[PDB]
Amino acid sequence: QLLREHWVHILVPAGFVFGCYLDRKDDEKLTAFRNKSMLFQRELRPNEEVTWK
Amino acid sequence: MMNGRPGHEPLKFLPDEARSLPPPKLNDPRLVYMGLLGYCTGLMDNMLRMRPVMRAGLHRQLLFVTSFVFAGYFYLKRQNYLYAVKDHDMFGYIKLHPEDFPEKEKKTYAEILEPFHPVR
Amino acid sequence: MLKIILPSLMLLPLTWLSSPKKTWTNVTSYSFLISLTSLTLLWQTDENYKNFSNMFSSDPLSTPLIILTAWLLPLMLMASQNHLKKDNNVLQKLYISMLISLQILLIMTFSATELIMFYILFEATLIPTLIIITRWGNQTERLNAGIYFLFYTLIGSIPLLIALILIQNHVGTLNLMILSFTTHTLDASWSNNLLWLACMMAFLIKMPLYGVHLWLPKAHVEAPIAGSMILAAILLKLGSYGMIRISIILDPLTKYMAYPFILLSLWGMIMTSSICLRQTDLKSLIAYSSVSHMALVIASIMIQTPWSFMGATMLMIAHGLTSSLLFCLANSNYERIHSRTMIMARGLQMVFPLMATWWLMASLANLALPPSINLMGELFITMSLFSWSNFTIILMGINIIITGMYSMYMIITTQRGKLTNHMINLQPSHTRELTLMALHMIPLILLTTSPKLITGLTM
Amino acid sequence: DGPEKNYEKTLAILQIESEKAELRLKEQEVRRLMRARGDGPWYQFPTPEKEFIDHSPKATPDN
Amino acid sequence: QWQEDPEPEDENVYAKNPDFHGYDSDPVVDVWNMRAVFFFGFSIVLVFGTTFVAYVPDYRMQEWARREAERLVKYREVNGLPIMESNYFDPSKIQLPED
Amino acid sequence: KFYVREPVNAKPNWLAVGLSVGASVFMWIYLIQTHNEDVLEYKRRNGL
Amino acid sequence: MNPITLAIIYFTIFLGPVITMSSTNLMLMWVGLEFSLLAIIPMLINKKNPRSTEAATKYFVTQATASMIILLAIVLNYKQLGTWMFQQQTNGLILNMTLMALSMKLGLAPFHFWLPEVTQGIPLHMGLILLTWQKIAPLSILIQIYPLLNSTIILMLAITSIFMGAWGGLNQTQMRKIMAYSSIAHMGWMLAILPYNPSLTLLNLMIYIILTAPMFMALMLNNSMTINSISLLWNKTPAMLTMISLMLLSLGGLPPLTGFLPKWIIITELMKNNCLIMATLMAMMALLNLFFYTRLIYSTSLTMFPTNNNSKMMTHQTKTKPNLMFSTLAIMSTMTLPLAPQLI
Amino acid sequence: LRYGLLAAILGDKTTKKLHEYSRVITVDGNICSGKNKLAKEIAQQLGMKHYPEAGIQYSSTTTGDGRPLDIEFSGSCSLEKFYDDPKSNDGNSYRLQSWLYASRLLQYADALEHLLSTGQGVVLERSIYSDFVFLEAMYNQGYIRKQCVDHYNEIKRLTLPEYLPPHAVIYIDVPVPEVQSRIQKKGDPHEMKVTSAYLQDIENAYKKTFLPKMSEMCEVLVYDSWEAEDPTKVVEDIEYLKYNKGPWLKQDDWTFHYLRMLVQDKTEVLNYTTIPVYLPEITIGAHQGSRIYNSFRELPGRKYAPGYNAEVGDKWIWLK
Amino acid sequence: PFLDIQKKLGISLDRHFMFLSAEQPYKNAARCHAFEKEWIECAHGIGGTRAK
Numbered sequence A: 001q002l003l004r005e006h007w008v009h010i011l012v013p014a015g016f017v018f019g020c021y022l023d024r025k026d027d028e029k030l031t032a033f034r035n036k037s038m039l040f041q042r043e044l045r046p047n048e049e050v051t052w053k
Numbered sequence B: 001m002m003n004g005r006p007g008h009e010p011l012k013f014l015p016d017e018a019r020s021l022p023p024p025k026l027n028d029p030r031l032v033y034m035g036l037l038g039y040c041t042g043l044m045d046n047m048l049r050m051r052p053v054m055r056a057g058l059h060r061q062l063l064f065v066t067s068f069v070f071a072g073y074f075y076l077k078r079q080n081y082l083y084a085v086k087d088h089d090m091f092g093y094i095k096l097h098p099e100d101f102p103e104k105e106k107k108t109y110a111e112i113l114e115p116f117h118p119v120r
Numbered sequence C: 001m002l003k004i005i006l007p008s009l010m011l012l013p014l015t016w017l018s019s020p021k022k023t024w025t026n027v028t029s030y031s032f033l034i035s036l037t038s039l040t041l042l043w044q045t046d047e048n049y050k051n052f053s054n055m056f057s058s059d060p061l062s063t064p065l066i067i068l069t070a071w072l073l074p075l076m077l078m079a080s081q082n083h084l085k086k087d088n089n090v091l092q093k094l095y096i097s098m099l100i101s102l103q104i105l106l107i108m109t110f111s112a113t114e115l116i117m118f119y120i121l122f123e124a125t126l127i128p129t130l131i132i133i134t135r136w137g138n139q140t141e142r143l144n145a146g147i148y149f150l151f152y153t154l155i156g157s158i159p160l161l162i163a164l165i166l167i168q169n170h171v172g173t174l175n176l177m178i179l180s181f182t183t184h185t186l187d188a189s190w191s192n193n194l195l196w197l198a199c200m201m202a203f204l205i206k207m208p209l210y211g212v213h214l215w216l217p218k219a220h221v222e223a224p225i226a227g228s229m230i231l232a233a234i235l236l237k238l239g240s241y242g243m244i245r246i247s248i249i250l251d252p253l254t255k256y257m258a259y260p261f262i263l264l265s266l267w268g269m270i271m272t273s274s275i276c277l278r279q280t281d282l283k284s285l286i287a288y289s290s291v292s293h294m295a296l297v298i299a300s301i302m303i304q305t306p307w308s309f310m311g312a313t314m315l316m317i318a319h320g321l322t323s324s325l326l327f328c329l330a331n332s333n334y335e336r337i338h339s340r341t342m343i344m345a346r347g348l349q350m351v352f353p354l355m356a357t358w359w360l361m362a363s364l365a366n367l368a369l370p371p372s373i374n375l376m377g378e379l380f381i382t383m384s385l386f387s388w389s390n391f392t393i394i395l396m397g398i399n400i401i402i403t404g405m406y407s408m409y410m411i412i413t414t415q416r417g418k419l420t421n422h423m424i425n426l427q428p429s430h431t432r433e434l435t436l437m438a439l440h441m442i443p444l445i446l447l448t449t450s451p452k453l454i455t456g457l458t459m
Numbered sequence D: 001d002g003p004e005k006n007y008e009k010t011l012a013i014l015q016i017e018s019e020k021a022e023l024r025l026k027e028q029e030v031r032r033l034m035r036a037r038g039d040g041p042w043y044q045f046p047t048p049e050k051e052f053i054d055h056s057p058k059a060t061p062d063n
Numbered sequence E: 001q002w003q004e005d006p007e008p009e010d011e012n013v014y015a016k017n018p019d020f021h022g023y024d025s026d027p028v029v030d031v032w033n034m035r036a037v038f039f040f041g042f043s044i045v046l047v048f049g050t051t052f053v054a055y056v057p058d059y060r061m062q063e064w065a066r067r068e069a070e071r072l073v074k075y076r077e078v079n080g081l082p083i084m085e086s087n088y089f090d091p092s093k094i095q096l097p098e099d
Numbered sequence F: 001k002f003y004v005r006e007p008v009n010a011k012p013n014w015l016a017v018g019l020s021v022g023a024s025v026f027m028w029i030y031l032i033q034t035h036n037e038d039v040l041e042y043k044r045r046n047g048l
Numbered sequence G: 001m002n003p004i005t006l007a008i009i010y011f012t013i014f015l016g017p018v019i020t021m022s023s024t025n026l027m028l029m030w031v032g033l034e035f036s037l038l039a040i041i042p043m044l045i046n047k048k049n050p051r052s053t054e055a056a057t058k059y060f061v062t063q064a065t066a067s068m069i070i071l072l073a074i075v076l077n078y079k080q081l082g083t084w085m086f087q088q089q090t091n092g093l094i095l096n097m098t099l100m101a102l103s104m105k106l107g108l109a110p111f112h113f114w115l116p117e118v119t120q121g122i123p124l125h126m127g128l129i130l131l132t133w134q135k136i137a138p139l140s141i142l143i144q145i146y147p148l149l150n151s152t153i154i155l156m157l158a159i160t161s162i163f164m165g166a167w168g169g170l171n172q173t174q175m176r177k178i179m180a181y182s183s184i185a186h187m188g189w190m191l192a193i194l195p196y197n198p199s200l201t202l203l204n205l206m207i208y209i210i211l212t213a214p215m216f217m218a219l220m221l222n223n224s225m226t227i228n229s230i231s232l233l234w235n236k237t238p239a240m241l242t243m244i245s246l247m248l249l250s251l252g253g254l255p256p257l258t259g260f261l262p263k264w265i266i267i268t269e270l271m272k273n274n275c276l277i278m279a280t281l282m283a284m285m286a287l288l289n290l291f292f293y294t295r296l297i298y299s300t301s302l303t304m305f306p307t308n309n310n311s312k313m314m315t316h317q318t319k320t321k322p323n324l325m326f327s328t329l330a331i332m333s334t335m336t337l338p339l340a341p342q343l344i
Numbered sequence H: 001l002r003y004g005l006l007a008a009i010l011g012d013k014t015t016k017k018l019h020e021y022s023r024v025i026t027v028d029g030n031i032c033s034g035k036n037k038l039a040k041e042i043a044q045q046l047g048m049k050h051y052p053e054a055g056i057q058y059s060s061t062t063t064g065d066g067r068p069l070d071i072e073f074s075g076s077c078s079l080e081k082f083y084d085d086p087k088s089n090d091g092n093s094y095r096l097q098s099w100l101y102a103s104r105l106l107q108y109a110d111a112l113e114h115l116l117s118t119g120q121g122v123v124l125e126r127s128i129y130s131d132f133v134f135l136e137a138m139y140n141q142g143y144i145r146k147q148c149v150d151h152y153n154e155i156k157r158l159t160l161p162e163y164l165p166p167h168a169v170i171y172i173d174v175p176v177p178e179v180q181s182r183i184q185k186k187g188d189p190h191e192m193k194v195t196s197a198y199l200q201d202i203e204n205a206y207k208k209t210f211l212p213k214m215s216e217m218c219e220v221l222v223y224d225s226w227e228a229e230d231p232t233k234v235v236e237d238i239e240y241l242k243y244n245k246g247p248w249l250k251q252d253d254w255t256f257h258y259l260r261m262l263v264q265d266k267t268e269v270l271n272y273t274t275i276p277v278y279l280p281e282i283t284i285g286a287h288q289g290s291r292i293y294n295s296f297r298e299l300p301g302r303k304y305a306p307g308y309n310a311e312v313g314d315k316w317i318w319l320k
Numbered sequence I: 001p002f003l004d005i006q007k008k009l010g011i012s013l014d015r016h017f018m019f020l021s022a023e024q025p026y027k028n029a030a031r032c033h034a035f036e037k038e039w040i041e042c043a044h045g046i047g048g049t050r051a052k
């Protein structure tokens, strides 16, 4: 574990992971009309609880 | 303008009504932004005084971060309370004066004739 | 989008915390990867556009500009690598930070839902550009250039803030989806014509119009290079995007408040290309060509037809790529002769027979070569203008003629002729500055192979 | 994921911003009425204090 | 005079490290910068991005539109209907004013 | 090298170190406990 | 000055405004303003040169008249209504005279002619206090009586302050006058909105203080008082150019920095009341306010000027002057726009 | 605890420290007259410390490792080049002159920092009150253009009154041929090739200007060679001086305090020397200046504040 | 006021001789005591625009 001049390669992948997590968090925030839109509005399949998460 | 609001306590940072509001998360983007501002403050302090950066004043940097977060928590709580109060008084006024805010009833696009403006 | 602009922020610690010897490499490679992950938002299998939050959205007009902004950064970063190589490491890293800030702010602009977000970011873009032009320009006119480039913009943009504030006080939201579905026809009064002008004469300055373009030559001529790349590639398009977004709330005033600007654009396009026919400075020739191109985009957006918006998008992207390419090609010689005067060195294609192909292709992009997204744009807006009025082709044809002329004259009096035998300092070539032109041209070929993407809101 | 996500997320964002517009305009008219007439909690400008008046017997009757 | 340094004269590179690429003075850094550029820019971006973009399906609902157009001309001309009537909406649910 | 003029910041001020660290710890501790108390009172006033 | 004297004088300076806030009698308000007056002059006149004597005399003689005019307004109100508070149903002449004298106290145009002079005649400190802390009680008077002021001269004075501050700072090579004309312009922005949501006046005040105090510290670190002296900063203390640049570009309000928030939200609340063209003029002269800041930051940060042979001694020696609050105040300016809803 | 108002209030005053030989004493003279040999013995006998003549390198010696630096950091000046080429276009002469004024100025400041801090006396030699002598010598010759004289006198005007003068001055005189032959018997090829009018103008400047205006504030002790030898007699004269007739008498603890604070900060000391008066002999251009500053911050011991240099051997850097 | 430090602490440094009907030293009425008292007792709870 000597002379870590290469740990900096984790910053941008970390940023990508974090951004994807934040977008996931946002579309969790906006889980309204999830199956109430006049276009799809399908009844839940027998093993289904949420339609698109 | 909300200073003359009834029951308004003078120089009370957080009245007891504000304890009914939900607090922040402590993971709020703005509190971590304030921690980031504190970290950059320590970094700038070291840069100005011809010191190393990200290496020198870890106790000072930690203190900056904690001071910024520990102030932002309570300031954000106060601001949440004030905006809550705004909505509260607005709702109360519309509910007391419905003649000025009538139950409007709008129309459809089949009954109204909006004018056509070609491009051509 | 957040997954695109958080890594872009992480590129800054990647600069500051890396070695002096392993900082250009890491940031360049990771910038290429940001460009790669900026292709997820081309997954539009539907007609409905892509809203990720109240903040961010992405339409088929946003996405090409987004991708091009994320893609230019490695090119700026490699082009900026010969000069400021003997600069101190902190100065290098400051340059890198300014370029990445430009990337981030411009992505945020093209992804914004509200107009105020777009405003504060459209104006925040001024600070990196001014710093780049002024601290790293080579000449002494860079200061006046920065002043011009800043204050034209601010003069145009303060009324824009006033008009947006008015629209918020009138409607309540200032969001673009809601202003689309809730737009009242305007009463056609002076109080609304001033609103039209306040909303438009910030973007029209930045595109630019011919009445007001003096900032663009003074800046292109004096910015080091990467500033010139950006100022030719997306800062001009940052006005066209805004016009295309804001014009929806100005109907029917665009039917009669547009005559002066269409007319100025057309005549001044002819004027600018005639200037390009006769100009001692190569970096000014590219700039006046950019004016003569963006004028068509002005007229096209003013006409507000589908063909016209389409061709505007096509011309936007094509012009950005090919103009950045031409600025790189001129910088390639300026890094040796240290002179912008074109007739100085005029007999190349002996020493640089491969760069002289990139030159040729860059010019053929510039003039109307048909299998190219340049001619598609120019042709479709010509067709829109002919529908508008048949007497505009008389001007577009003069432009086409002069635009063949100045481009081929550039090629000839720079490459063809007898070599300037008194130039021992013509070093062979850089693999770096060959890869630059390859990365500018390969996208043009790909987008020509598939222009279904490069269209806009209307197709 | 699919199209339903984008469609319905857009619908959510639209109701949010529409409600915000409604409330901003409502706040404008509310402030207007409260300032034009002090019927409400806001814009209640101060008056002299009542508790510092002396109600005691004076030296003269017709105080 | 005001005691400034004079202009440093025209550098030549290929004297030192005639395999110079365009990036740095160290011969190792030039190599591992050009390899980085070439790999990350050509071999992943300009290849896999082209693949991704080429294998995006129904870009902006184009193939679907053609298929629907086909079945709809089929239905309309089989059932004797007027293909593509001259009014998007029906007057069954439109109210015009008088005068 | 070894300075002819001995600086001020040669050895630390362990007092300031301890004060800063104890202050940061006390800040975080009061913050977490205040946060728990506020959450609990929010649930207690607004019911569940 | 011995310590007893400094204690007395700084206590008096702190208590002038504090009496002015926590007082319902206008007369104790006047008393606080006079403590601020009396206690400032010793430290203005501390270095004992003709420039300092002139500055102190100009300050004293301009502030005494304003004080007498405020006392006249107060006594006329007492005659009219038998109280020590500006109620409603007072005379607009009384209220306007109060406004005029308060503008003379602040330094607003066309009562601005003394502020740059006085500021040049005194050190960097005593410019900071004069421009930040002395502005707080005179503003408190207006804030306490905001629904009684005429909305016409309140705006003409603001517009004059804007225009004249911009035009005066356009051509000032001295920095101690640039700060003064900046004060004039920002007090203009404040006073324009003061009848319209005076919370924003205090917002602009706090932003202005947070910007000016570290700028004064920057000037203090090398006793820079001229464009040519601040230009020799890429050699002496070059780690400060970043913050100086962002602070100047916040002062001249540019969006990504928090110094644009006060102008933006002021324009908002002014367009909410159909005060449109005035706001347009103000926003268009703030650009000229920005121009000389841009010239300055060219001169110091982007186009490094010639230096001297003797400036290497400064590089040999070491420094201690940055008080650790320059960092906090410079970073809380220039980077706090995304927290603007918590500021408003 | 850095010194300040808090310390002065706690009781670190100054008048408690002065006993009898708490005295700023300067020995002056011409180029070779016996100044160091005399000042050293004065300091030994009376209990002061010797502060040698401030040359091109005093800041370097009192900063960092205390070594000589390359000549482009410690000025851009050479004294040899002044003796072998005194009318250069390259303004080595006034560059040297101003650098040496600044070095004498910092020297006097360090001296006063020591005196008021400790009460121990200080022996200087050829202080900032006697540096104009060489300037006047250069200007009577064509070794200076007159604008440099205005620059020097302005900097003097700005820097001198802030500081207290010496109590006594000791100007030992030698005729010009005597010092010239002494230079010949010194062993320097460069000092050997100096004129006699230069020395005579130094002497005229001293005797005319420096002696009476300092006799208006200080106790002069003019001696000769036969008197300058045997320092013990000069010391025995110093021991019995009535130190009246000067501004030291009207000094309180708080005047000493503010002087001690002005002197504790070398940047405030040297600020008025770094003024932007743009003489070509003093300006060094942005490119050269930046090269020098970078190369200076890429030295051992530099690049950071003193204690914050781990490449030297400093420690506890993450906790300062 | 601006900073109601008096109301915070309940003291009255100056807010008890604000007008005529206010605690004359020995109980001597000022003239218009009744009128001012009545005006003030009307304008209580109300603020400003409605009391005017």
Ligand SMILES: Nc1ncnc2c1ncn2[C@@H]1O[C@H](COP(=O)(O)OP(=O)(O)OP(=O)(O)O)[C@@H](O)[C@H]1O
Residues within 6 Å of the ligand: H030, H031, H032, H033, H034, H035, H036, H053, H079, H096, H097, H100, H101, H131, H134, H135, H191
């Ligand atoms: N201000 C000045 N300007 C120009 N030259 C100076 C200045 N000060 C000193 N010098 C030069 O520095 C040299 C210093 O010699 P100095 O008179 O100090 O002798 P010393 O070291 O005191 O011992 P001695 O007097 O026995 O030689 C002289 O040659 C003189 O010319």
